[PDB]
Design a protein around this nucleic acid. Structure first.
Ligand SMILES: Nc1ccn([C@H]2C[C@H](O)[C@@H](COP(=O)(O)NP(=O)(O)OP(=O)(O)O)O2)c(=O)n1
Ligand SMILES: [Mg+2]
Length: 378
DNA sequence: CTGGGGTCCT
DNA sequence: AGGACCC
């Protein structure tokens, strides 16, 4: 019952899209900027020392010749992302989205059909596509090895189809679960793929230097674990189950300790259509209810176009604010306005979000972030 | 000089 | 409503 999973991660996604829009940007060192942050950059700027999530001032110091493009509008990135996901859904219907640029696909059924169409004389002719992690030797008599190789071939066909149909490049990783497929996809970058045979799992899991490098272990869990002297993957592997059960609860403890061994039983979930739409806007300061009302109007209009095109009606609205630490107030959308989506649906919505806003803050302040979300879609 | 999004769990 | 995680 050993699965074959592929994880696809796009190379400098936003930068890649911006280079497609304006091929002029292809040669020069490019960075995509949101407010004071260079959120991603092309390979050239990366050679010049620019790194992801670097300060615009630090990136400009490291690279004064750097050219920046504003990427605070995720419209193009969202379109392209869902094009990638749909194309992968053409291979296997079960595709899971992670962020805008990552996709898990379960290739087990497909690999099975491909193998069952083959003849024994062709079984020795099975070859890997792309890198093999750790230069490990392929045993063509190992059925798991064969299935993983076929998975590598399917991954290659996926990347080639992404390039020929969408002009996008990315990295792929083929493994037996989602954690390992994601961990091995980034070994060779960019525009390469790597397959992980089982015998090398531990090697991969011990190539990490920080426990936060494990997907599923974030900032709070990492700092917490550090407070107990757990700093390496082997520390977490060998640590006492009961203590971290006490420190993190039973669920977090068991699951992340299983992750420390490369074990991940979670299935690939069909993402399908989005569960929510939302838009944000940060600022140095917000102190006027009129300006807050105007920003909320700006978010509302774009959200209305986005939801109108989707063809599903949201049944909950929420407002999020950040103080001088985030707070939110939501409520159902009236069926009167819900049914008539696409009339001046604006004015009542502004009234609703302004009432929630008053619940949050007293007009009778310093806000640094305003966000609006349509949730509970149908 | 720290964005703009998403998911699921409690 | 908030908090954990992901990009
Ligand atoms: N914290 C983050 C992480 C990613 N992103 C956006 C910018 C990225 O272009 C896109 C993909 O994220 P990413 O895979 O973490 N880095 P990117 O794809 O740019 O480069 P690679 O390292 O994957 O080649 O999401 C963001 O806006 N905020
Ligand atoms: Mg990427």
């Amino acid at each position: 019952s050993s699965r074959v999973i592929v994880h696809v991660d796009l190379d400098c996604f936003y930068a890649q899209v911006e280079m497609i829009s304006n091929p002029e940007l292809k040669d020069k060192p490019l960075g995509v900027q949101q407010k004071y942050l260079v959120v991603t950059c092309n390979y050239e700027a990366g050679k010049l020392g620019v790194k992801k999530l670097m300060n615009v001032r630090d990136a400009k110091e490291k690279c004064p010749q750097l050219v920046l493009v504003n990427g605070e509008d995720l419209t193009r990135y969202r379109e392209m992302s869902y094009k990638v996901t749909e194309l992968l859904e053409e291979f296997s219907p079960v595709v899971e989205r992670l962020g805008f640029d990552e996709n898990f696909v379960d290739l087990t059924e497909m690999v099975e059909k491909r193998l069952q169409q083959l003849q024994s004389d062709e079984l020795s002719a099975v070859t890997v596509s792309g890198h093999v992690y750790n230069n490990q030797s392929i045993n063509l008599l190992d059925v798991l090895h064969i299935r993983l190789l076929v998975g590598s071939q399917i991954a290659a066909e996926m990347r080639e189809a992404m390039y020929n149909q969408l002009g996008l490049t990315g990295c792929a990783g083929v493994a037996s679960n989602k954690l390992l497929a994601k961990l091995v996809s980034g070994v060779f970058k960019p525009n390469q793929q790597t397959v992980l045979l089982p015998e090398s799992c531990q090697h991969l899991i011990h190539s990490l230097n920080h426990i936060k490098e494990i997907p599923g272990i974030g900032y709070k869990t990492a700092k917490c674990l550090e407070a107990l002297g757990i700093n390496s993957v082997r520390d977490l592997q060998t640590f006492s189950p009961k203590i971290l059960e006490k420190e993190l609860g039973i669920s977090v403890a068991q699951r992340i300790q299983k992750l420390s061994f490369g074990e991940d039983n979670s299935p690939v979930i069909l993402s399908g259509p989005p569960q929510s739409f939302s838009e944000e806007d940060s600022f140095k300061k917000c102190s006027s209810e009129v300006e807050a009302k105007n920003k909320i109007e700006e978010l509302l209009a774009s959200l209305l176009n986005r939801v109108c095109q989707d063809g599903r009606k949201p049944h909950t609205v929420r407002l999020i604010i950040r103080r001088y630490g985030r707070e939110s107030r939501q409520c159902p959308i009236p069926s009167h306005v819900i049914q008539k989506l696409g009339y001046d649906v604006m004015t009542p919505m502004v009234d609703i979000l302004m009432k929630l806003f008053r619940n949050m803050v007293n007009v009778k302040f310093h806000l640094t972030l305003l966000s609006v979300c349509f949730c509970n879609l149908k």
